[PDB]
């Protein structure tokens, strides 16, 4: 909104912004590794203590 | 020795090959399990990666099938000897620099590589559009006429193939190339990837020279001397590198005596004119759609080779 | 009706004080 005058100017009319806000990406990932000697045997079934 | 039976069950079932189906609105489950291959991606939960079985020996199996994994190579690069608005099916050039300890490689796409050839003397206009100024990759080869001027410029590129995802940083670009296998993005929707190459710097070599047709047409590539600038030129093609080497040959047959006409070879290794080297394979049929480029600008025609294979050779001379 | 200003105390007077900044920075034009 805006004030109104009683001297003189030339005087804005109903200002109204329209402001938008796009979104950011963000892509954070790390690396593991782990042994085949540890997947093998992660994939078969033991019968031995 | 009963469990050596339970150990030929858990090894013996291959693939499925054939499979009787009756109907096709029925589907049963025996076509799904023909029909499903395993992901490479999912969502973090044991039960959830049990499931994707990608804890399983080299090769996706739910607790071989004639698929290859893909390999991924890493490259370091500066912010500005690249423009994060490239496409992501395209092939990269790394330059070997000339430091013992680098750490920080020097990669160029060809329309980058295509400003290190014009500055010194359409498509032109968006390579001059993307990389703006020639100076900020003029420096990233140190002595580039002296290598064009003995002619030892092709042994010192090896190409790394198609690209697939650009971490956009702010200094140092983390770009991941396929140096071999089966060209398929990293992507939470896992997307189809197709390289593209520029059209203008890409003639076709089937159409030009206007039965047995393969299913695995390659694609290569080629550096040639000129001496109004050396170019960069691509080829597609349904024969063998022997057939290769004699059509490109042909091809060449104006350039050759060009650039013999213009510029006696004084020296004795000027007389290379370039050399060629396999990109890889793609399907045959579908190969080579046209489609379009937009920058904020302009706009290059530019061709889409489809579901790629990259396979790097090395440099096998024109003459 | 309440009225929202604040209020100090000089010896007799208990004069309030209030401030119009924050009613025309809103309308952006100088105070």
């Known amino acids: ?49 | 020795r009963r469990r050596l039976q339970r150990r030929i069950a858990g090894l013996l079932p291959p693939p499925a090959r054939r499979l009787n189906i009756s109907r096709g609105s029925e589907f049963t489950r025996d076509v799904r399990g023909l029909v499903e291959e395993h992901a490479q991606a999912s969502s973090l939960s044991a039960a959830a990666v049990w499931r994707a079985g990608l804890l399983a020996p080299g090769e996706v199996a739910v607790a071989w099938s004639g698929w290859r994994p893909p390999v991924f190579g890493d490259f370091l690069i500066h912010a500005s000897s690249f423009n994060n608005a490239e496409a992501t099916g395209t092939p990269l050039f790394q330059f070997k620099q000339s430091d013992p300890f680098s750490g920080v490689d020097a990669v160029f796409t060809p329309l980058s590589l295509f400003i290190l050839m014009n500055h010194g003397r359409g498509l032109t206009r968006m390579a001059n559009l993307l990389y703006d100024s020639p100076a900020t990759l003029a420096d990233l080869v140190p002595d580039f006429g002296r290598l064009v001027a003995d002619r030892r410029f092709h042994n010192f590129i090896t190409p790394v193939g198609p690209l697939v995802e650009n971490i956009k940083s702010t200094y140092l670009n983390k770009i991941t190339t396929v140096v071999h296998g089966p060209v398929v993005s990293k992507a939470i929707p896992r997307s189809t990837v197709k390289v593209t190459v520029p059209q203008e710097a890409f003639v076709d070599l089937d159409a030009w020279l206007s039965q047995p047709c393969p299913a695995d047409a390659r694609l290569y590539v080629a550096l040639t001397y000129e001496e109004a600038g050396p170019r960069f030129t691509f080829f597609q093609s349904s024969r063998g590198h022997c057939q290769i080497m004699n059509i490109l040959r042909i091809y060449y047959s104006p350039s050759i005596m060009h650039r013999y006409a213009v510029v006696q070879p004084l020296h004795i290794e000027e007389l290379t004119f370039g050399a060629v080297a396999c990109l890889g394979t793609f399907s045959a049929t579908d190969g080579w759609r046209r489609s379009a480029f937009n920058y904020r600008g302009s706009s290059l025609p530019v061709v889409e080779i489809d579901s790629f294979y990259s396979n790097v050779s090395d440099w096998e001379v024109i003459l | 009706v309440p009225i929202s200003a604040a209020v100090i105390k000089l010896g007799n007077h208990a004069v309030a004080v209030e401030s119009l900044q924050k009613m025309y920075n809103d309308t952006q034009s100088p105070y």
């Open chain 1, 1 to 49: 909104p805006t004030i109104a005058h009683g001297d003189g100017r030339r005087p804005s009319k109903q200002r109204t912004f329209i402001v938008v806000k796009n979104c950011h990406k963000h892509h954070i990932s790390t690396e593991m590794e782990l042994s085949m000697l540890d997947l093998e045997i992660l994939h078969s079934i033991p019968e031995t203590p």
